[PDB]
Amino acid sequence: SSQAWQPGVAMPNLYKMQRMLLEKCDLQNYGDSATLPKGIMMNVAKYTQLCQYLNTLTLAVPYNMRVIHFGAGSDKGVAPGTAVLRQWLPTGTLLVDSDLNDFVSDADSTLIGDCATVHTANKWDLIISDMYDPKTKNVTKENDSKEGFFTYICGFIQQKLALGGSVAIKITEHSWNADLYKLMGHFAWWTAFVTNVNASSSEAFLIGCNYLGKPREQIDGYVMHANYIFWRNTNPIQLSSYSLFDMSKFPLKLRGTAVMSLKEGQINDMILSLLSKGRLIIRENNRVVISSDVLVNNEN
Amino acid sequence: AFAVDAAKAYKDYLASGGQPITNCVKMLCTHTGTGQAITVTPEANMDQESFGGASCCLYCRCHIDHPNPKGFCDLKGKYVQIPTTCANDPVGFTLKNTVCTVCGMWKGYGCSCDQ
Ligand SMILES: Nc1ncnc2c1c(I)cn2[C@@H]1O[C@H](CO)[C@@H](O)[C@H]1O
Ligand SMILES: [Zn+2]
């Protein structure tokens, strides 16, 4: 294989360059399930493989790193994904998480509500989203670009992701947004990553690596999602938990990446090159301050 | 004043044969760690499982105030090592046992300080 010993599979570049039409997603191993190590939750395995993959990219990893995790809760009321992120991230990393539904978490701070209500004074070095509405999986209806939390995420990236920062946003066959794909063209590099433990699902993490704040490439998100589905439809991925058994190199290396505050007029080509290499973060280094808008209503 | 005694309730419930709190978040790790009880990253040794701390805290999981004037949680945001023999009930374990303030190991499950 080779592939089975990886944490998962990233979309091959040649698929990204196609001009496919959107088809239904029919996965060969649709019903298979990976055999997880004893007592390990699917979400722990999935986030572990995601982070193992992110370790191979040029992530900026500054001191006083700031990470926000959307969709972090679970029907069990805990946050397995946040627990993996906090294990992965350097000690002292500030980690905020959030979900529509209540849950208890190891994050430094948690906000409960619709993500559209969330505001932050500060910019972020990494944004993780597992938000998902299972009502989108409706094979009887056309598969159009979805708005809702994807609209929020696109604006949140453009307003609050530090230059040099990165994102991993969960999508599926039916949970996707064309503007989010278009925004992948504003990073030095991007992919769609499928975990090997969840390879029987149309889920992937859309990863934008090193944000540039402007388009490097003009991407048609409708076509690109069609390209992603075509890749999945024609490339069965063998379910695998092999990578979970080797955790010796798991922690993200604290690279001490430089943080500078700069005005837009100062972002020259040399800065852009540094940003594209994982060697610079541009943002204020002020305090992390968050809030959630609360709708007030009467019943009397 | 009246205050619910959540710890006694879980302990009595267990003795009565109630099923231990589940969905404690177990971590993947090398199992070559220090073996200390409560750490900033997973530190299970070969005889332990490491869990996300919040999910093993009775007060966190049951949405009740922490038994601390400050309301500060000992486990949230950290990782708790549970002997593999007791990992069916991480919440019961953390509740019924105590960490040595000198070596950081669980009293009776790693603490060798009275030797
Ligand atoms: N608009 C939102 N804002 C914040 N979180 C959201 C949503 C929606 I739609 C779904 N979710 C959360 O995503 C988790 C995975 O389904 C679930 O835990 C679910 O609660
Ligand atoms: Zn607690």
Ligand SMILES: [Zn+2]
């Ligand atoms: Zn001791």
